[PDB]
Predict the structure.
Amino acid sequence: RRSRHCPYLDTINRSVLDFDFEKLCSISLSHINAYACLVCGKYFQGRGLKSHAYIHSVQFSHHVFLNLHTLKFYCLPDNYEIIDSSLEDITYVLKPTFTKQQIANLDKQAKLSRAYDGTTYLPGIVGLNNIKANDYANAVLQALSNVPPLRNYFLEEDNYKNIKRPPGDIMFLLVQRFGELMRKLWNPRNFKAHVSPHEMLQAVVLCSKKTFQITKQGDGVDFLSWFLNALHSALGGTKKKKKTIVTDVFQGSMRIFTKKLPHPDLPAEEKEQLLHNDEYQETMVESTFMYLTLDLPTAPLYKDEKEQLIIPQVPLFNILAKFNGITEKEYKTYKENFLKRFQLTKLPPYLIFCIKRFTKNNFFVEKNPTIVNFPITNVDLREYLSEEVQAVHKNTTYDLIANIVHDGKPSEGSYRIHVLHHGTGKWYELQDLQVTDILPQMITLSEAYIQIWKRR
Amino acid sequence: IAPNLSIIIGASTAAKIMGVAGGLTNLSKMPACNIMLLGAQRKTLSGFSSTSVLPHTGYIYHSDIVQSLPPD
């Protein structure tokens, strides 16, 4: 009963505490009753007689330990609990619990969060530590963390908890670790200015069946699509719910007019009679899209006559000229060509654009460097909806929230990400540990890869 | 002031060349080989070659029609 009288609070040094690590004993590699030595930060077997924590305490004379699963402090050489208010910051670093008011206030939050080391930072925009050259996953997660509805849904543990899961399900481990990592990202009282996603990368490898490996630098588009589909699949009961959080945040309704094309080396009369044969006629198919794939136009492939070697630039509206009845797209399938023309039906509240780079040609894979010119302030999408579905919609104005850029060749590239801070309106570009303030003027001056837009 | 000369080249270029020359009469009295040297700043070569500097280049060299040609 000698608590509140521990003479060892001075030995605690918050600088050497890295709670991003997996909670396993440093000797027995056991997950049960993880205890961290606040003097050194290494985990141990647990509080008990002749245990690893006890051995460490009697060897290195470390007297204060923290129970990872309990969020309570103890002394092993004397073996008594600790009840102090000064240790609550460590508890919040380990287990950041966000209340509803603070969760809502993150949109209006405009104070520069200060870390223990003194490197004042901003909530949400926190440097992600690359491990084995897999910056694509870090960039995708940073882009996803900027979505307000997703932030509200994942910030509080019980919001995505209390659901039925399959007994053999491991996807819920990934979905519940994303919440932990993201509430670490939004925590305004971090000991260190950065966040280590290594546990998230390990869970991604465990659930992805060896794809999106830490070693390999996979495509951002495929990783984002797989992550969204997996998050939708995990959540809900034992049977999938029609409208999960990912569905109501990103999914939209779009319409495809697929028309079969006869062989171009056919007689005109034969082509006409085949068209009249009801097989090569237009068919309407509705579908749900998590994102819109933007096909960059063909490169000039030749120097400009006047100002030689000019990088191509395309307005965003020419790319947006897709998804309407006026424009078609002759898909040159190896079997036969298809005349597929798209048309948007129901815009999602949040929009994801994926600019198709890294297109495999007939012999290898090359990256299209064409730059897209877009108004960062706002865009209009009411003009790309059919007249039947424009009555329901009232908000088609979209503003850019997140931007992904790939720098370098496909063999070895770097994934940089610009994010818009809602509180201040400033754009911040972060690449690995590097974080910098970037003016919105030159946001469009980069090889945009994935864009996240908000309908407001 | 100069309708034909404003037709030939850009109006801004025409104004600049008459201003540097001293007047319509002053410019009309100048030889053709001298007008193209009007407003030719002595750009200093910063270790680069003289060709990079593009010397003996005047406001006419930077006009609209001239800049719409290949460098050679």
Summary: The interface with chain B takes residues 305-306, 308 of chain A (CB under 8 Å). Residues 315 and 373 of chain A are 5 Å apart (CA to CA). The longest strand of chain A covers residues 397-408.
